Design a protein around this ligand. Structure first.
Ligand SMILES: *Cc1cc2c(cc1C)nc1c(=O)[nH]c(=O)nc-1n2C[C@@H](O)[C@@H](O)[C@@H](O)COP(=O)(O)OP(=O)(O)OC[C@H]1O[C@@H](n2cnc3c(N)ncnc32)[C@H](O)[C@@H]1O
Ligand SMILES: *Cc1cc2c(cc1C)nc1c(=O)[nH]c(=O)nc-1n2C[C@@H](O)[C@@H](O)[C@@H](O)COP(=O)(O)OP(=O)(O)OC[C@H]1O[C@@H](n2cnc3c(N)ncnc32)[C@H](O)[C@@H]1O
Ligand code: HEC
Ligand code: HEC
Ligand SMILES: Cc1ccc(O)cc1
Ligand SMILES: Cc1ccc(O)cc1
Ligand SMILES: [Cl-]
Ligand SMILES: [Cl-]
Lengths: 515, 74, 515, 74
């Protein structure tokens, strides 16, 4: 029923015939009951708008090269997924209706984990849980960094979308080193030192020689990543997690400005999370229904009530110290004095919180131990509707306060909540807002879609843009970055994918556009 | 098989959300849930719950997890 | 006399006429006495092989856009330089004879240095000395990271070639954030968050959205960088430099293997230098002539004599600790115990060395204080002949020893010395070898050229390639990285520079090649 | 001018190699070296010494540094 845009039932049939001959019959999925699990989205639109025409599962590089040769012949557009757990970002479904999904979950081979040089080379289908098991079984002194869906997600998929973790190796793309990409013409390209025959430095030195192209493939449709290498943090002798609970919503300005010199100097070396009360609540598995059934947003009065009953603050910061006992002790003395000198916020440690949530999962996330605890955010209102609005800001307190207020206002206007957190780097914040709504309610989804549009319009006006967005808003966000950028991106696209077969529409890059 | 046993699928995937200590999803242990129903929820996904393709969790593994869940005490 | 390859005297004259009308008469240099300072090379080839046809000096982005419009009209190839101090890498001279030099030294404006967010946005002509003065005058709490030519070199030029520093912000391209590039069609592209109007996050968040292209422009000819942003390290309260002198040449294996866990854990956070005896000698201003006048390499006997008379070792490591007094004290206790447990090498501090060389300059380089002391390397044999052979290796001791021995052998064969140093990162080494020779002696230059070819042939065979190379060997090194890479690089080149005007031959990228 | 004075050019560029405490290049202080000679070495470069274009160090600045060097004691 569902066919690729511009492709006729006949050309599609010749393609499926060639897919079968190359991969086998159980590796080509064309029946709608097999396609159904790829269609599940948490976006405010019907499944039909992002429904695939087929799904093929490759296991070797020779097969990916094969699928691409067939796709060029019959002008078939492919959407590549690795572990496909991109919830709130399009999930496993294509940018456009009718694209064929090149599902690489079956390519789950861990090629090498070097315990001395501290690196890993993996295939797309490898999950973080699969890696955690291998590290536990073989007693390797390495630590992982991962996104919250941890166990079910993987390194290749998360880094292609430039995702974030919580250990000192938190900015995942910063720690990436070497990748193999299958180009649209069938050629296998290896970045950095990979092109050199007999090289043992692919996961050692990032750049290589000549232009360094790893970045060009991330958040782009210029190739299919088949192998990816990255650096692993060595397991430190002592890990000391902590939380600092703050009472007022206006405290954000002083928290950020006080935290900055500590992040910059690397005293606190990990990606710090400053979670809002509602985010904190959702992760501790508290629902809205157990506090109010009134329509619209959750009033300030019931949020203040929520704080008294549970002990959460307006802002809850989770950080972590790593190193030797003596290294941790001097850093703890520096962190403690900064907070005492502020005269704000309660400091809670592993001894006085320990087995209680949300402290437990955050401590686990900061030390590379998997858990899916954060999925409680989808239980706050339920319905299975979630989208990530994630603008970028300066790690400056006045900016964080400004962005928080702007977001809160537009969300309340559509009767939605401000459930957010700041992920802190030395100089930047990933201001992550979860626009949660009930997807089974048609009126609330229509509101959520409008809310997301206004969130983008409001922020762009103040000079802010998002770092990553869902499949439905990928073209919209491409506009925030100006015409010259898009023009350059379409020039490179014509050069590496003249037939427009590699995921057209990804990041707003499509040859059917006038650029 | 793909996950070896149903206990393994539950420990590595499902239980991260479904185990009593977690509570992201409802308890499935010793509830006598039909294999045909578990197969429907995993393939279609249910509201807050994501859907998993056959390439991630196959038909044979779903049968094993359904059987493992029925055999445990409530 | 000297004209661009493929361009006639007539077309060149119309171009020079248009250059004059656009820039003024004192900004267009066509007389050979004005062109002479751009021609000075330390490569084993005559000046004629890298002589420019003209030199234009732009001061604004509008002018660079102008120069590029004129260049596209008359098919004129331009070679862009910023501070042009690329000694041992081609200097200020073009890859190919007759190219026009777009000299951007006059674009020397420091646009912004934010002391709170710790970043800098500069123009191409800004020197590190100019920056040091601005930081001293305005009492800003920031520290710089630079290459050894420091005072005379600049941020934009060194980072376009992906150079290295000695502070914790040593891998310069890792700390780069946002750049403005003028493309071949005249368009002004801004990476990361620059495309967003009214953005204050250009020097804050690296990636942006969609493909991240900063890396694509470095060591490439896809655009002319007009503005570049980077992160600055905040000035730490205490700085503790040190040296560890080792006696045997075979000690390299244990030094590297013991240093690795300290670099990886960030205990020693800066780019560590492990300098050979001859490198150390050259930097302390000792000449070969004051030890031997015998032809060929410097024998092991006179190197051993050199060690006794001065107190230098076979390997001299320079590192540094940063932080608060308490942070430095616990880290010093960790570093000291590692070296005591080894039972090798003498530890020398700032108190027992202080004002003596080479300790003084290395301590200055590791704290962002300019000096040109390392230029003594050109006095070791004199003649003004110097080329950098810089292979990449794993920060594993056996590999360093293997590379050292391979290099030493091929160099001695041509009667040259092994004057080298390892610049250490957590996982990689920049094995920097200075192939020094007398350029005024025609027989020794012919030997040096052959030696450099053999060095590349010997290392490629063992799977090693260089990270950066001189203009004369840029096409040769491009071959070490395979055909698929070159093919991809020429596809992108055809797309962004169809008329082949932006520095053809840079990193072996030229449309006149068959790729 | 471009460097203001000849003392400034010497402190910021030349002296980094030429000052007595450094010794990368020979002492130029109080040696009575002709302006025409200093102009030739800086524009052509001499062996180990690099060449500086007019855009870096202009003719007017070379005149000032030659004059500053002659006025100092040996
Ligand atoms: C629901 C939820 C989501 C979260 C989260 C917490 C909750 C409760 N916390 C996250 C966090 O801390 N940090 C993140 O970065 N993300 C968080 N997310 C979203 C999360 O689901 C994703 O980050 C991530 O793990 C996505 O899942 P994935 O790892 O399975 O990746 P993917 O396979 O879906 O690929 C993503 C994206 O990348 C492109 N693509 C994938 N693979 C390739 C290859 N091989 N070649 C080319 N392009 C490729 C594609 O566009 C795909 O959609
Ligand atoms: C002689 C010597 C050289 C050294 C050194 C010590 C000695 C004694 N120590 C170095 C060190 O510690 N680390 C390094 O990375 N390099 C050292 N070097 C070599 C050194 O001279 C260079 O690294 C560096 O300072 C080069 O000088 P530069 O900063 O003046 O750069 P440049 O202007 O020559 O530009 C270099 C290269 O970049 C390309 N290009 C320049 N500008 C642009 C723009 N705007 N757009 C596009 N491409 C651009 C061009 O190919 C140019 O040649
Ligand atoms: C977290 C991301 C989950 C994982 C992994 C799995 N499930 Fe799940 N499941 C989850 C939620 C949040 C819910 C509730 C959805 C709602 O809105 O009600 C569920 C529900 C189910 C059910 C329905 C139970 C009922 O009471 O009717 C079933 C049968 C079920 N889940 C099965 C299941 C299996 C077999 C899984 C592993 C393959 C699995 N779930 C994983 C969240 C999550
Ligand atoms: C280090 C990178 C240098 C800088 C900066 C400058 N000079 Fe230099 N100079 C340098 C060397 C190593 C040498 C000796 C070269 C050799 O092989 O003999 C020189 C030499 C000169 C001379 C000649 C002196 C003589 O006794 O004949 C002159 C006149 C001179 N240098 C001038 C000069 C000026 C004016 C500079 C600033 C613009 C300058 N030098 C900078 C190394 C370096
Ligand atoms: C927890 C989180 C972080 C980033 C993101 O984009 C989504 C969710
Ligand atoms: C000192 C040095 C370092 C790197 C380089 O490529 C050249 C010289
Ligand atoms: Cl989604
Ligand atoms: Cl040179």
């Amino acid at each position: 029923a569902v066919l690729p845009k511009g492709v006729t039932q006949g050309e599609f049939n010749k393609a499926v015939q060639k897919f079968r001959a190359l991969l086998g019959d159980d590796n080509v999925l064309v029946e709608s009951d097999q396609l159904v699990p790829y269609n599940k989205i948490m976006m405010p639109v019907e499944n039909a708008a992002h429904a695939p025409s087929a799904a093929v599962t490759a296991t070797t590089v020779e097969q990916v090269q094969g699928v691409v040769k067939i796709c060029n012949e019959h002008k078939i557009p492919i959407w590549t997924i690795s572990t496909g757990r991109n919830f709130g970002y399009g999930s496993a479904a294509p940018v456009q209706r009718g694209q064929v999904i090149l599902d690489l979950k079956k390519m789950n081979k861990i090629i090498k984990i070097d315990p001395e040089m501290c690196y890993a080379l993996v295939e797309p289908g490898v999950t973080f849980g699969q890696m955690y098991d291998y590290i536990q079984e073989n007693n390797l002194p390495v630590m992982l960094s991962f996104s919250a869906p941890s166990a079910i997600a993987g390194p290749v998929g998360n880094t292609m979308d430039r995702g974030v973790g919580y250990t000192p190796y938190g900015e995942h793309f910063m720690m990436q080193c070497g990748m193999e990409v299958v180009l649209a013409n069938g050629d296998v390209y290896r970045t950095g030192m990979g092109g050199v025959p007999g090289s043992n430095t692919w996961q050692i030195f990032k750049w290589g020689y000549g232009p360094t192209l790893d970045g060009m493939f991330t958040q782009a449709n210029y190739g299919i990543c088949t192998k990816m290498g990255f650096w692993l943090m060595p397991k430190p002798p002592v890990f000391k997690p902590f939380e600092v609970i703050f009472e007022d919503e206006a405290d954000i300005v002083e928290i950020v400005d006080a935290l900055r010199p500590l992040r910059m100097s690397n005293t606190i070396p990990n990606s710090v999370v400053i979670a809002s009360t509602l985010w904190e609540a959702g992760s501790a598995h508290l629902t809205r229904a157990q506090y109010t059934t009134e329509p619209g947003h959750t009033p300030d009065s019931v949020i203040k009530q929520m704080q008294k009953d549970t002990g959460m603050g307006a802002w809850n910061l989770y950080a972590a110290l790593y190193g030797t006992q003596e290294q941790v002790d001097v850093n703890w003395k520096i962190v403690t004095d900064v907070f005492k000198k502020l005269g704000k916020g309660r400091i809670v440690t592993q001894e006085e919180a320990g087995d209680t949530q949300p402290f437990k999962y955050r401590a686990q996330l900061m030390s590379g131990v998997p858990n899916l605890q954060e999925f409680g955010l989808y239980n706050w209102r339920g319905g299975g509707g979630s989208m990530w609005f994630a603008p970028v800001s300066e790690a400056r307190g006045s900016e964080c306060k400004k962005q928080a207020a702007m977001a809160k206002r537009v969300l309340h206007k559509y009767g939605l909540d401000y459930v957010a957190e700041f992920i802190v780097a030395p100089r930047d914040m990933h201001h992550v807002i979860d626009v949660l709504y009930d997807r089974t309610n048609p009126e609330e989804t229509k509101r959520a879609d409008a809310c997301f549009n206004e969130l983008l319009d409001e922020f762009e006006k103040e000079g802010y843009a998002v770092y990553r967005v869902n499949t439905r808003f990928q073209d919209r966000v491409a506009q925030s970055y100006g015409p010259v950028k898009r023009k350059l991106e379409h020039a490179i696209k014509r050069a590496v994918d003249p037939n427009n077969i590699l995921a057209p529409g990804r990041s707003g890059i499509d040859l059917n556009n006038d650029f | 098989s793909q996950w070896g046993s149903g206990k393994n699928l539950y420990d590595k995937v499902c239980g991260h959300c479904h185990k009593p200590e977690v509570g992201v999803g409802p308890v499935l242990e010793g509830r006598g849930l039909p294999e045909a129903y578990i197969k429907d929820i995993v393939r279609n996904g249910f509201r807050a719950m994501p859907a998993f393709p056959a390439s991630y969790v196959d038909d044979e593994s779903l049968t094993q997890v359904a059987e493992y869940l029925s055999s445990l005490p409530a």
